[PDB]
């Protein structure tokens, strides 16, 4: 996997762009579109030939003091139209119609900053938010219900910075400033039932409020992978990729080498390290890697505008093949990357509000 830099631009606000996401629910034949979030806005662009990045429209929050950190795409499960969720310092999740940029509805709960949003891989209505208040929450955006809060003293003890669902959306791994990675299974009887009841809730037809699950005990926890804030995590099948601000993505799994992930118990005290991908100059926290749709590759930018891309299409994780992408004018910290669904474009976004387009 090789790329060349075809364009770049800078947004007018000059504040960090903390998040970038292509819409992988784009319709066939339509051009590729991505969203950026930073300052108090989200902006959409369309990718065209000759490197063109065509500016469409933004949503700008009414509060000049909001600062959006994260966004995620889904679609309306009745109409198929794409939807974009965004959130950040105010702790309010907004669901935006990306065509008109109207905010269709919003959700409050965390009241406290939201550091990441992820939609479930099989159900477009299930949205996970992770917060500076130390909890994760799972919302159903079809019935507008809070399904569950994942927290308690056995939960995270400091800001949660990232989380990821596994392939089938059976379990979440979360991580944050307490240096720990925690697993929360959502295919328990209690959680599958809470999900089904969330779909059954319509406040116009009943008197009761919808009761959320309080999940106070993760199904596995470790602090033995990193020694500082853990700011991005992703499943790779039954293994985990996670990073801190220590210039390494560690590939690891709960338990011993031969332990099946669905047999791990909450008291498991071991982990197995399958590999580690080192890189340079990424000492600051809130720096996220992304993978392509197929999980064949992983990209991470660092604090001086260098991109690293690992090819994971190899027999074992430690055999990953790295290439790097540099441009003499890109020298600000890269906060997040995103691949188009077809893998032909990689976009990096930066602390000086610039956006960089690399074409395969």
């Amino acid at each position: 996997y090789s790329f060349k830099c075809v364009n770049s631009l800078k947004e007018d606000h000059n504040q960090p762009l903390f998040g970038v996401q292509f819409n992988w629910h784009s319709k066939e034949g339509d051009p590729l579109v991505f969203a950026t979030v930073g300052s108090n806005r989200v902006t959409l662009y369309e990718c065209h030939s000759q490197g063109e990045i065509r500016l469409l429209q933004s949503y700008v929050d009414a509060d000049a003091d909001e600062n959006f950190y994260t966004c995620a795409w889904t679609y309306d499960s009745n109409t198929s139209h794409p939807l974009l969720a965004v959130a950040g310092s105010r702790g309010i999740i907004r669901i935006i119609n990306p065509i008109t940029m109207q905010c269709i509805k919003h959700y409050v709960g965390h009241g406290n900053a939201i550091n990441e949003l992820k939609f479930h891989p099989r159900d477009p209505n299930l949205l996970l938010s992770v917060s500076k208040d130390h909890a994760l929450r799972l919302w159903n955006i079809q019935t507008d219900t809070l399904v569950a809060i994942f927290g308690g003293v056995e939960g995270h003890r400091d800001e949660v910075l990232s989380a990821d669902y596994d392939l089938l959306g059976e379990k979440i791994m979360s991580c944050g400033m307490d240096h720990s990675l925690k697993l929360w299974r959502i295919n328990s009887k209690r959680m599958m039932n809470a999900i089904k009841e969330s779909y059954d809730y319509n406040p116009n037809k009943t008197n009761r409020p919808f009761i959320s699950q309080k999940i106070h005990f993760p199904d596995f926890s470790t602090r033995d992978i990193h020694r500082n804030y853990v700011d991005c995590v992703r499943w790779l099948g039954d293994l985990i990729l996670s990073k801190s601000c220590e210039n390494a993505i560690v590939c690891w799994k709960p338990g011993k080498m031969e332990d099946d992930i669905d047999k791990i118990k909450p008291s498991e005290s071991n982990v197995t390290i399958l590999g580690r991908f080192d890189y340079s100059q990424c000492d600051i926290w809130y720096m996220r890697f992304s993978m392509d749709f197929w999980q064949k590759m992983l990209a991470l930018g660092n604090q001086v505008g260098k991109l690293y891309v690992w090819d994971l299409e190899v027999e074992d994780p430690h055999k990953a093949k790295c290439t790097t992408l540099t441009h003499h004018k890109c020298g600000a910290a890269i906060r997040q990357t995103s691949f188009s669904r077809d893998s032909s474009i990689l976009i990096a976004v930066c602390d000086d509000a610039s956006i960089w387009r690399w074409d395969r």
Binding site: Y229, D283, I284, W285, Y286, Q303, A333, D351
Partner: peptide, 7 residues
């Protein structure tokens, strides 16, 4: 203690 930004 880790910083979010280079400053």
């Amino acid at each position: 203690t880790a910083r979010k930004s280079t400053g």
